[PDB]
């Protein structure tokens, strides 16, 4: 449990993360659905308790880069993942991109459109270059 | 269509004796077979179902026996209310309905 | 046409193994002996010959596999005497539960159409717009 | 001696379709559910006929304490088809498929071919605060859809007048895979020490309310009045001021006219039928038969057939189908040599006067 | 006592004129009406993606989905110049002025009560108490700036629209203007347009009185000066009025933001029918990728497969046609907000009808959500 | 007491339509299907028509079909037959027939009516 | 242009004349000409909101004076003529 | 190929018999019929918006450049006083 798994319950085949939930379920009820037919929740064959169904972790990925001739520093946005989820992920080493952005503990940024890794913070403010998302701006600016 | 064939056309017998009516079909059809009693004017009366069975409120004296394509229907006492013409008809091949060509029973 | 280059495989089965012969199909034949591709582009030819795989007194000459550990790949051969595993005896021999992986092909003059011996070669081709190295009798004219 | 008052079935005899949990949805379901407010027939007790079973049939009953024990299903109700019996005695059930013989009341005297004997907890759970006016009504529903015999129920003292108005659910309790064939339905009674209400499903489409625990707190029914589809076109249980277009009508048309110039197109049927001299097999006539309309009919009638198999084609299906060409090879031949004249046959005509081809799309007539 | 009835439609009331050759009529008092207006800005930002809607997690799926070509390029371009088109449209509506102003420390415009459409301190968002009605009144299935991952397994009952759609890969984007900033944004307009009259629209901010931008928005209408400063007392109390009551107008009503809420609609109902498409057979043996791939031999189990490539396709293509009708049709709605807040706002308009019933005098922009609303 | 009294017979003109009606009391009318069955006079009994317990499920002999139409009504317990475009050999007399289920839907006659003649002539 | 025939047009009809068999396995392709029919209902509603916007523009219907003499400007073609039936001018009549 | 043998005609008529050939050939129909569709849909919205920025275009032209406009950030940021136009390939250009 808790864990991002396969499963074959009883004919029902497909990935997800299962955990305890607060339901009601009638004595007779066996399944999960919601308003668009998809599993949402199992019943346990065992010890009788509701088991909910998260789907995996997925989103687009995103280069914010400045303009070619003058660096060729990159930064990457994983868009709606909370940036511990995708930093574990990057420490297991099972995400889809095989292309690595360094992680100096500097450049971090949960930001409210996904996290970005490669540009760090500050606490100024300047007219907009080009648009992340969310009230978030980035440049590439001299030190 | 099963076409279902009368052996006795009419048959005279007095009162008191034992008449067989026969009745035949062009394929099997088990078990499934009526009779019906029918007198000159009236409205037809079931006699038996499922070609062995007696209907209810009928009197023992009417029986029957026979599966395929053959059957018989054997009457052991003949009754002042018994010389009528009796049709069989089948049910096994449900989507259409056929009758006998009825067979006719009369006073000797 | 033109083909680059032509493969021609050439073996003796029986009656019904010719109509199991034939891309993506069912039989220890088409699973264990010979598995034509999915997407084959070529021709498989058939003719009855009784004359050469038969004689008096019977010919055991041929062979074919019915016991192996996995399915065969397409063009993929398995030659190979290695008697197949039934649990997890290591039984090297033949008998109990430990099956020969080949069984005779045995042919005589007098058996059934389904049974008699059929010689069976196929010809694949891999046909694009690409260079050649068969050709079919065609004159060149001169270029204008 | 039992009545046959009629009553009102109101809302009642919703079960759930499937074992799925939802919670705070409308879905839409299709299958056979009891309609709406509709008439259901009420009997009496104090004899036991054979109610018709079809597409499942709902079953209520209110009673003090028991007087009904069981219930027996299954065609001809005799020794020679399967049938059923759900008999309940005080402490267990007794669910079996066989073939027991007839009882005319110790309920069957006859076991030799049949299994699928089972056994579980008792259906009828009475209870009681200290007095008998908590009459214990029971709702039961059953049915045969792709065998598995189906039984829901719930059990409670409603008021105890009659068959009630307030909206109730059923919870299923077994599903056992007999599936023979049920036709007829009957009611056993007591032994020796104001119910009866039978109503018949049909195929309907209902939009059922869902709590949030997974309980079903109201239904709608799709064809009772004006209403009630607009309901369910923008599916909700609130509809705002306004005109909705729903669905659409049309009207059903009530005759059917074959007019045609002529259509008698004789066929030489007759004349090969009517003919003197039929050739014999040796020389067997083969008449060509086209440009006409082939009528099956005066083949009928002319002749009283005593083989009349057919291979390529039915015998019942020859006036729906439209014929290239039609040969007629007549010829008068022995009795046994008829049952000889078929494809794939051997014998001294089969070989040396006529042979009928393996591939033969016709049907052969013969007649004394 | 109660019933419905049928009736031809009433053009209006009767009414005649007294037209004569020697008569005129000229009216002796005036009244203050503060009307409403509401117009769409922008939709919601969705982007969907190929491959995992149309074949999930299958390799064999996707390469057959590989010989159907560049179909799910097309189809990564529209959504995006879409989000960027609603962006672009914010940024026209409300981004009309580059310097923000505040509003005086004091509050005493010469008895005119602006507390109604002023930011509130108390308040965390700074939000006037209009805006709050607006926003209580709008109801979003999804915000899309929530980060909902993490609580599926949390929705402890049936899991909602949002998480189906996660389930089925659809997302949605949050604006790049958050609805803080653009409630700032329209603050600083409110007080531009308040204390230094029309100039700071054109030119550099010159503070004005109250009264006297009053008095030149009279003389604009064609009425003197004269009148606004003889009766200041009784127009002020009539604006007081006009503003207490709309208020109150906005909150009994059943629903006067209607456009903003079926913009909203239409969106989470092409959204979930697309979701619905998913479990649609088309004609195949089933519905399920992974049942259809045990039960049938791989030769021919590829014509059962083309057969939801397509359907999915198709339902995408249709999908994505609607977003774009739906993205014009807001565009356009977007482009009349933005002259009506430059011309109403910044200025005085002579155009009739155009910035409200009447002669115009001012208005005043209001932040809702996935719209603006203006006071005339 | 189970009664069923047909009604609406008479004479008639080749080419021209007919209804009939069989009033069904004493029993579970709307449970049971019915029947219709004629007989030529010379002639044993003949299958016409056949419609279920509510109304969905219809079948007609092939010398009918398509000109003769059954229907049902259950909140008067009546059943009907309505006959278009009659000719000479449609001259019998129709009886109307309860059903009871037998190895299939209805395969028994149980009770009969008295029956209505009805005869077309010029 | 103020507005355009409104249409209505209907899938089952239009597909499958009255046919059981080909409606159902038009019900088999899921809700996609639902879309089509409120595409067509959202159609007429539009048309009826522009010809209310472009001339139900006054609230209250005035009437012209019974004497038709503005300082000798004679509009005796634009208003509407008693005589005729409709009530239209001959202006409106040429363009009908 | 759209999921046919090959993608060159004039390849899958010498390669296959006529009889199945119209098999692998109504594939390649479909493919290339949904892609033009696609394609004269966008090329209408295009011209849909173009035709709106050419409408304003015309306007903006006649107001500014034939007269003089009141109209506030209408004919450039600021009281108004002329506009000169420019022509520019597929386009219109003005100096306010
Ligand atoms: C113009 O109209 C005003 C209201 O529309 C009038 O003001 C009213 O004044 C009375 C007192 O006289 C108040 O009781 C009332 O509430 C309202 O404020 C105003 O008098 C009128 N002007 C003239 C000249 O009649
Ligand atoms: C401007 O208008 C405000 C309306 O929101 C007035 O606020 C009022 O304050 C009183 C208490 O003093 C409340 O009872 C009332 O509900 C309202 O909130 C405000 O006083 C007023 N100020 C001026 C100067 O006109
Ligand atoms: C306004 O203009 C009308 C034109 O339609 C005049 O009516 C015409 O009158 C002439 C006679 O001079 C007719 O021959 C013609 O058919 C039409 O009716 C109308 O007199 C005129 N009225 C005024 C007041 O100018
Ligand atoms: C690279 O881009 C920068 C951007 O300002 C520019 O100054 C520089 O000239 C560019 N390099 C070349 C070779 O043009
Ligand atoms: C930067 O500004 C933030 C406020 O936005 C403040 O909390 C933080 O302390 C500042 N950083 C430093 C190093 O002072
Ligand atoms: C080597 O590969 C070929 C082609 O797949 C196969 O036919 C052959 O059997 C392989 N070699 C051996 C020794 O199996
Ligand atoms: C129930 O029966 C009564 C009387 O027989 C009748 O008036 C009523 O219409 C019937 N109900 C329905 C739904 O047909
Ligand atoms: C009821 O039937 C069960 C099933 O055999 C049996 O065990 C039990 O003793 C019976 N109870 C009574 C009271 O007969
Ligand atoms: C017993 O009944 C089963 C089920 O009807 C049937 O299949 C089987 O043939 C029967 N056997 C005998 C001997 O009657
Ligand atoms: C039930 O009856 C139907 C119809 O006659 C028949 O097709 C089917 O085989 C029967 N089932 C059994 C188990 O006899
Ligand atoms: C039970 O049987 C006894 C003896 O015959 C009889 O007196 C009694 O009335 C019976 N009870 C019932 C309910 O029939
Ligand atoms: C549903 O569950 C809630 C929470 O325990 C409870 O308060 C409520 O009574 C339940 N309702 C039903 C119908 O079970
Ligand atoms: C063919 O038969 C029809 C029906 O009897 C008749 O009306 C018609 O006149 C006949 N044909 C000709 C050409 O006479
Ligand atoms: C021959 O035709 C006559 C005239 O209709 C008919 O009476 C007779 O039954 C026919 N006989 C045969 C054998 O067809
Ligand atoms: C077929 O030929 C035989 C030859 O004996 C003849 O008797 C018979 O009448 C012929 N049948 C016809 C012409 O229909
Ligand atoms: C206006 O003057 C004209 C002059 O001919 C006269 O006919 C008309 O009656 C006058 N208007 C009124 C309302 O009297
Ligand atoms: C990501 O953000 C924080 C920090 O980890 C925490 O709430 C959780 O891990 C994620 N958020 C949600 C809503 O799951």
Same mark, same amino acid.
């Given at each position: ?143 | ?108 | ?144 | ?7 009102? @079935? ?7 379709? *499937?074992?799925?949990?939802?919670? #705070?949805? $409308?879905?839409?379901?299709? /299958? %056979? ?119 829901? @129920? ?7 007048? *009659?068959?009630?108005?307030?909206? #109730?659910? $059923?919870?299923?309790?077994? /599903? %056992? ?119 099956? @009919? ?71 | ?376 | ?122």
């Amino acid at each position: 449990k808790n864990k991002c798994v396969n499963f074959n319950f009883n004919g029902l085949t497909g990935t997800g993360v299962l955990t305890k939930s607060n339901k009601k379920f009638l004595p007779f009820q066996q399944f999960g659905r919601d308003i668009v037919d998809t599993t949402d929740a199992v019943r346990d064959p065992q010890t009788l308790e509701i088991l909910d169904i998260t789907p995996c972790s997925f989103g687009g990925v995103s280069v914010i880069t400045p303009g070619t001739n003058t660096s060729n520093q990159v930064a990457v946005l994983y868009q709606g993942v909370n940036c511990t989820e995708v930093s574990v992920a990057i420490h297991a080493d099972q995400l889809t991109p095989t292309w690595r952005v360094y992680s100096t503990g500097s450049n971090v940024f949960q930001t409210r459109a996904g996290c970005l890794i490669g540009a760090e913070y500050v606490n100024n403010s300047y007219e907009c270059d080009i648009p992340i998302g969310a009230g978030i701006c980035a440049s590439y600016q001299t030190q | 269509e099963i076409v279902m064939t009368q052996s006795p056309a009419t048959l005279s017998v007095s009162p008191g004796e034992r008449a067989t009516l026969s009745c035949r079909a062009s394929q099997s059809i088990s078990s499934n077979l009526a009779w019906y009693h029918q007198k000159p004017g009236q409205a037809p009366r079931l006699l038996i179902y499922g070609a062995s069975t007696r209907a209810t409120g009928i009197p023992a004296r009417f029986s029957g026996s026979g599966s395929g394509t053959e059957f018989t229907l054997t009457i052991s006492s003949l009754q002042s209310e018994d010389f009528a013409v009796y049709y069989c008809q089948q049910y096994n091949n449900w989507p259409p309905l056929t009758f006998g060509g009825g067979t006719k029973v009369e006073i000797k | 046409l033109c083909f680059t280059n032509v493969y021609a495989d050439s073996f003796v089965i029986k009656g019904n193994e010719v109509s199991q012969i034939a891309p993506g199909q069912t039989g220890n034949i088409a699973d264990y002996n010979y598995k034509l591709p999915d997407d084959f582009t070529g021709c498989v030819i058939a003719w009855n010959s009784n004359k050469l795989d038969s004689k008096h007194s019977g010919n055991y000459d041929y062979w074919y596999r019915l016991f192996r550990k996995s399915k065969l790949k397409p063009f993929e051969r398995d030659i190979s005497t290695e008697i197949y595993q039934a649990g997890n005896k290591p039984c090297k021999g033949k008998g109990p539960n430990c099956y020969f992986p080949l069984q005779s092909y045995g042919f005589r003059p007098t058996y059934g159409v389904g049974h008699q011996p059929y010689r069976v070669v196929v010809l694949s081709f891999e046909l694009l717009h690409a260079p050649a190295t068969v050709c079919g009798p065609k004159k060149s004219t001169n270029l204008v | 001696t039992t009545t046959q008052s009629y009553t009102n @079935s109101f809302t009642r005899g919703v079960y759930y379709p *499937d074992k799925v949990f939802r919670s #705070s949805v $409308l879905h839409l379901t299709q /299958d %056979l559910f009891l309609p709406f407010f509709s008439n259901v027939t009420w009997f009496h007790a104090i004899d036991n006929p054979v109610l018709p079973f079809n597409d499942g049939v709902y079953f209520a009953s209110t009673e003090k304490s028991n007087i009904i024990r069981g219930w027996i299903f299954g065609t001809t109700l005799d020794s020679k088809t399967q049938s059923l019996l759900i008999v309940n005695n005080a402490t267990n059930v007794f669910i079996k498929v066989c073939e027991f013989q007839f009882c005319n009341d110790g309920v069957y005297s006859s076991a030799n071919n049949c299994t699928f004997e089972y056994v579980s907890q008792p259906f009828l759970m009475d209870l009681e605060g200290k007095q008998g006016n908590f009459k214990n009504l029971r709702e039961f529903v059953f049915k045969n859809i792709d065998g598995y015999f189906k039984i829901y @129920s719930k059990h409670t003292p409603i008021i105890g007048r *009659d068959f009630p108005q307030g909206f #109730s659910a $059923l919870e299923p309790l077994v /599903d %056992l895979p007999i599936g023979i064939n049920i036709t007829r339905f009957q009611t056993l009674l007591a032994l020796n020490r104001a119910d009866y209400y039978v109503g018949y499903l049909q195929p309907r489409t209902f939009l059922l309310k869902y709590n949030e625990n997974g309980t079903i707190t109201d239904a709608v029914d799709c064809a009772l009045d004006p209403l009630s589809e607009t309901k369910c076109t923008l599916k909700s249980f609130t509809v705002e001021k306004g005109i909705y277009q729903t669905s659409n009508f049309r009207v059903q048309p009530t005759e059917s006219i074959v007019r045609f110039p002529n259509v008698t197109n004789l066929c030489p049927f007759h004349e090969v039928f009517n003919a003197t001299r039929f050739a014999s097999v040796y020389a067997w006539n083969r008449t060509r038969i086209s440009n006409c309309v082939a009528d099956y @009919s005066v083949l009928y009638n002319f002749a009283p057939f005593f083989a009349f198999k057919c291979y390529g084609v039915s015998p019942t299906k020859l006036n729906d189908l439209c014929f290239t060409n039609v040969y007629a090879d007549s010829f008068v031949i022995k009795g046994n040599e008829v049952s000889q004249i078929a494809p794939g046959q051997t014998g001294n005509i089969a070989d040396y006067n006529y042979k009928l081809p393996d591939d033969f799309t016709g049907c052969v007539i013969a007649w004394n | 006592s109660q019933s419905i009835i049928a009736y031809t439609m009433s053009l209006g009331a009767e009414n005649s004129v007294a037209y004569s050759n020697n008569s005129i009529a000229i009216p002796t008092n005036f009244t203050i009406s503060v009307t409403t207006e509401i117009l769409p800005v922008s939709m919601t930002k969705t982007s969907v993606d190929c491959t995992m809607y149309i074949c999930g997690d299958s390799t064999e799926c996707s390469n057959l989905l590989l010989q159907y070509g560049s179909f799910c390029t097309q189809l990564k371009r529209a959504l995006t110049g879409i989000a960027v088109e609603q962006d672009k449209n914010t940024q026209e509506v409300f981004a009309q002025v580059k310097q923000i102003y505040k509003t005086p420390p004091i509050k005493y415009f010469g008895g005119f009560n602006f507390s109604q459409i002023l930011p509130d301190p108390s308040k965390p968002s700074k939000r006037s108490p209009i805006e709050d009605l607006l926003f209580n009144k709008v109801t979003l299935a999804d915000a899309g700036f929530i980060k909902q991952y993490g609580d599926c397994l949390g929705d402890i009952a049936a899991r909602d629209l949002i998480c189906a759609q996660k389930f089925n890969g659809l997302t949605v984007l949050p604006p790049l203007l958050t609805d803080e900033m653009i409630a700032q944004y329209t603050s600083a307009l409110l007080a531009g347009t308040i204390t230094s009259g029309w100039t700071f629209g054109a030119g550099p901010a010159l503070q004005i009185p109250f009264p006297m931008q009053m008095a030149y928005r009279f003389n604009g209408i064609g009425v003197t000066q004269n009148v606004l400063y003889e009766n200041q007392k009784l127009i002020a109390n009539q604006f007081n009025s006009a503003i207490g009551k709309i208020q109150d107008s906005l909150f009994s009503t059943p629903s006067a933001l209607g456009k903003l809420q079926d913009v909203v609609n239409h969106n989470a109902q092409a959204l979930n029918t697309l979701v619905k498409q998913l479990s649609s057979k088309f004609g195949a043996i089933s519905s399920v990728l992974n049942d259809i791939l045990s039960r049938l031999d791989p030769p021919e189990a590829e014509v059962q497969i083309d057969r939801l490539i397509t359907g999915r396709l198709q339902s995408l293509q249709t999908y994505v046609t609607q977003q774009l009708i739906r993205a014009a049709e807001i565009r356009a709605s977007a482009n009349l907000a933005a002259t009506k807040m430059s011309e109403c706002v910044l200025g005085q308009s002579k155009r009739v009808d155009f910035c409200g019933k009447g002669y115009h005098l001012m208005s005043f922009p209001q932040s809702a959500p996935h719209g603006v609303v203006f006071l005339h | 007491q189970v009664q069923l009294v047909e009604s609406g017979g008479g004479v008639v003109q080749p080419g021209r339509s007919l209804r009939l009606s069989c009033a069904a009391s004493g029993f579970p009318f709307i449970i049971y299907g019915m029947h219709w069955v004629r007989q030529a006079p010379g002639k044993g009994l003949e299958w016409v028509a056949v419609i279920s317990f509510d109304g969905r499920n219809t079948y007609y002999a092939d010398s009918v079909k398509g000109r003769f139409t059954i229907s049902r009504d259950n909140s008067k317990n009546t059943l009907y037959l309505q006959m278009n475009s009659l000719r000479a050999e449609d001259t019998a007399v129709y009886y109307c027939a309860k059903a009871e289920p037998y190895i299939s839907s209805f395969d028994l006659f149980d009770y009969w009516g008295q029956g209505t003649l009805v005869t077309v002539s010029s």
